[PDB]
Design a protein around this ligand. Sequence first.
Ligand SMILES: CCCCCCCCc1nc(-c2cc(S(=O)(=O)N3CCN(C)CC3)ccc2OCC)[nH]c(=O)c1Br
Ligand SMILES: [Mg+2]
Ligand SMILES: [Zn+2]
Length: 292
Amino acid sequence: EETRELQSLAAAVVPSAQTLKITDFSFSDFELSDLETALCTIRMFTDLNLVQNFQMKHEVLCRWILSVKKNYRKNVAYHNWRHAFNTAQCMFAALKAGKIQNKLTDLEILALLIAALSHDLDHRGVNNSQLYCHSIMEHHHFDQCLMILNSPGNQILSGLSIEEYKTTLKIIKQAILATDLALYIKRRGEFFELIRKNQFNLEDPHQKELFLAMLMTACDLSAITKPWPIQQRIAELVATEFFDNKIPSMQVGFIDAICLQLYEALTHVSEDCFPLLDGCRKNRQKWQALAE
Ligand SMILES: CCCCCCCCc1nc(-c2cc(S(=O)(=O)N3CCN(C)CC3)ccc2OCC)[nH]c(=O)c1Br
Ligand SMILES: [Mg+2]
Ligand SMILES: [Zn+2]
C-alpha cells in the first residue's frame, strides 16, 4: 500500500494551480484527500519552476513528498501533515499572488518551499513533548528534513552543484529555525523598526535573511488569516492539541500580540499580501464579538 501510493501519485495527472485554487490566500484543504494534497504539492514545485531549474525527476519528487507526508503524525490534532501542507500553500500564494517571488532568487524559493513543508516534521504536539531555550524542536525538525533529503530515491536536490546545495541547506535550516516562536519574538523588533523608518532593504544580505525568517512565520501562522468558517475549524484543532468559552479572548490576544503586526509588516513589503492582513483583521472582529 506504499509503492501503491507512490504508483498512483506518479501516474496521476497534475491539474493546474488555478484549478486547484492553491493561488488563493483563502485556500482550505478540508475537502482534499492525502493524494490530492500530494498533487497540489507537485503543482507548487512545478509552477515555481523548481522541477525545471533543478532537474528533478518526477518519481523522486513524488517519493520525497510522500516521505515528508509520512513523517508527520496523524494522531496529533494540529501539528500534522495538513498544517505543513497549508504552510507551504501560503508560501506559494505569497510568492505568486503576493508577488514575493520576483524579490527572491531561485535557490531561496526552493529552500522556503522545502522548509515550509518540512518545518514541523515528526512533531508530537505542544504538550506531548529545553530550559536552555535553544530551539531544540526546530533543530529536530531540520534534522528530519535533512534525513529525508538524503534518503535513497528521495534526493530532490541531487541536481544542484555542491555550492548550490550548501547554500540551500543553510537557507532551509535558518528558515526552519525561524519558526521557533521565541526566535520570531526576538527578531521582530528589528524588522518592524526598519520598515517604520523606511530603511528596509532586501539587497542587504542581513535584511534579506531577516525577511525570509518573517515570511516563514507568516506562513506558519496563516490559519489565523483564513475565512471565518475555516479559522473556526482550525482553532478547533489548535484547541484540542493544546488541551488534549475562554477561547475567543485567547484568540484576540494571540492576534494582537503576535499576528497583526507581522501581516501589517508583510503588506508594507508587498502590497499584494494584503489579503493575509485583511483576513486576520476580519477574524479579530469575529472572535472579539464572541468574547461577549
Ligand atoms: C511560528 C509559530 C510558533 C508555534 C505556535 C503554535 C500554535 C499557534 C496558535 N496559537 C493559538 C493560541 C495561543 C494562545 S497563547 O496566548 O499564545 N498561549 C500559548 C502558550 N500556552 C501554553 C498558553 C497559551 C492561546 C490560545 C490559542 O488558541 C486557542 C484556540 N491560536 C492559534 O490560532 C494558533 Br495558529
Ligand atoms: Mg513549529
Ligand atoms: Zn508550524
